[PDB]
């Protein structure tokens, strides 16, 4: 037993990393195949990230002027071409490592590891969730661009996300691998912020299942309550509205627990309306959103990856 | 900015990662250049941890009862030793992706990343402490043994957990990679449980300072107070007690951020007679405490690992 916000194993992810340098601008880049993708905003200038043009620029620049680092290996770029916010630098050496991977766009309330890197080198691996206003609580300081966050099946890697920039708030904004920003942000130096979020209700929900299988039940009641009755709660404490199919997804966890969703949602509203007093929840005195029905499955279950 | 409960890339890791099955038991094994380690606990039968003897039931095995499996390749055992509580299998073939590596054995208030497995095959992976009764926080089921915790030195790879088992309150206990155990713990089913715990002090102050480097200030005050004054604090709220040197190991987050010790201290005195007052810090309700300084440094400069 135990709960702990667990990443994917980082290794089949590392092996792609490199550095890209161009003009003064270093940041990261992931070589799959013979391409290295990497935020297109590394072909910038400090006075560029103004009001830049990037297909002005890039025009304008040459194969040479991008320096790949693989490890202690340089590799010609022999092509370069933009997709939307991402830059695809075609190399002359395909990735040995490559995994085997697809390019998904996930969905907020879903969860992956980011592996932060700098200068081409993995420095540590977490886990995240998209928030309802598509930007992510990370961690990435100067030079993190084109970290990736991902989900791995099986052997497969889906690389979901690659990290463009900090908000005000301290939040994080990117794009999904073919170079679309998650949310309305964009790539430039503008006043623009995250906007409202809410807190994702069939997650605290599957976090709640996962706190009884590991043996936290004093928040149980007899009660119950109706799903639009719950939904006039949730609504009232800023929380997301829960649908049928959010309700069909716990059926899982309902099963193995004996704890009928619908009271699950009688706890949880119980929960927003009288606080905790003084007790935790899985090591946590706050209601906790970032873990999935399938991410309390495969933890408090045991998937593995080769 | 922004800060996130970070494990080490466990690419080095998983590479050494392998199956060890000996009759009806299956763990996990750590393959560095020929020998295999593993928990010795794998040579038991379910009647024989009642009140098992290793020496006796090592003795009785053979080579080929040990079943080693590095993916789908198998390994030949060709000698077996007992070190304390560890199992040494001497294979035929090194490991071609041993890391440069140490054997270390860590301080409760220390910090590392777990590399769950199942099978030989890595799960997740995340960071723990060990808390000062000698027990680790941990996610681990049933044949997760074998399992290590380590931190990683630019590219040097220091195991220094390996995971024997779990105690009745949830939390998990298990040795160092030469076999020893941490704290007063025996690999047999017994009635053993984990003692009182303690709440690492110098620990939360690092964490307080991360919540001021990420811009978390309602908790700052212009009071201070005496290291000896603290102390009493700290001893009613069942916090272990700073020392100097504690103090001294702060003392770069201290610079950094323009805040004595003494006066986060004096911050943390009132946090603990106050609660938090329907606040948070670095999005928690609780005062953290498994950041080290090393931790908070680390990640608030951005340090990698090649
Ligand atoms: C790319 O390495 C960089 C990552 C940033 C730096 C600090 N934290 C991060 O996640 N991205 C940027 O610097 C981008 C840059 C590309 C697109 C627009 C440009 C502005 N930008 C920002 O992140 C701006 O915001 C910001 C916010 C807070 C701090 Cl302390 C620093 C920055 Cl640069
Ligand atoms: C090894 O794979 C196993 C890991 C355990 C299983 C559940 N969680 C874990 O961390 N270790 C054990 O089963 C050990 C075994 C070797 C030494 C003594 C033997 C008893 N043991 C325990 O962990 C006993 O405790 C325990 C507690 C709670 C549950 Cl749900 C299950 C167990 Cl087995």
Chains 1, 2 share one sequence.
């Not at 977490?126 to 990736?148: D, E, H």
Request: glycine letters at 8%; charged letters at 15%; proline letters at 4%.
């Amino acid at each position: 037993s135990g709960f702990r916000k667990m990443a994917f194993p980082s290794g089949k992810v590392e092996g792609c990393m490199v550095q890209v340098t161009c003009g003064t601008t270093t940041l990261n880049g992931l070589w799959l195949d013979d391409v290295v993708y990497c935020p297109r905003h590394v072909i910038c200038t400090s006075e560029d990230m103004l009001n830049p043009n990037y297909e002005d620029l890039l025009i304008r620049k040459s194969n040479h002027n991008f320096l790949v680092q693989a490890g202690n290996v340089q590799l010609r770029v022999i092509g370069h071409s933009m997709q939307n916010c991402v830059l695809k630098l075609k190399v002359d050496t395909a990735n040995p490592k490559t995994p085997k991977y697809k390019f998904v766009r996930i969905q907020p309330g879903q969860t992956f590891s980011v592996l932060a890197c700098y200068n081409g080198s993995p420095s540590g691996v977490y886990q995240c969730a998209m928030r309802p206003n598509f930007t992510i609580k990370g961690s990435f300081l100067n030079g993190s661009c084109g970290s990736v966050g991902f989900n791995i099946d099986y052997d497969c890697v889906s690389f979901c996300y690659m990290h463009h920039m900090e908000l005000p708030t301290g939040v994080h904004a990117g794009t999904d691998l073919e170079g679309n920003f998650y949310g309305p942000f964009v790539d430039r130096q503008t006043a623009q912020a995250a906007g409202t979020d809410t807190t994702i209700t069939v997650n605290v929900l599957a976090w709640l299942y996962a706190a009884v299988i590991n043996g936290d039940r004093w928040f149980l009641n007899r009660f119950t309550t109706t799903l639009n009755d719950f939904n006039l709660v949730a609504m009232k404490y800023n929380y997301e509205p829960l649908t049928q199919d959010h309700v069909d997804i716990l059926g899982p966890l309902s099963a193995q627990t004996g704890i009928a969703v619908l009271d699950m949602c009688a706890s949880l509203k119980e929960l927003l309306q009288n606080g905790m007093n003084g007790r935790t929840i899985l090591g946590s005195a706050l209601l906790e959103d970032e873990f999935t029905p399938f991410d309390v499955v495969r933890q408090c279950s045991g998937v593995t990856f080769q």
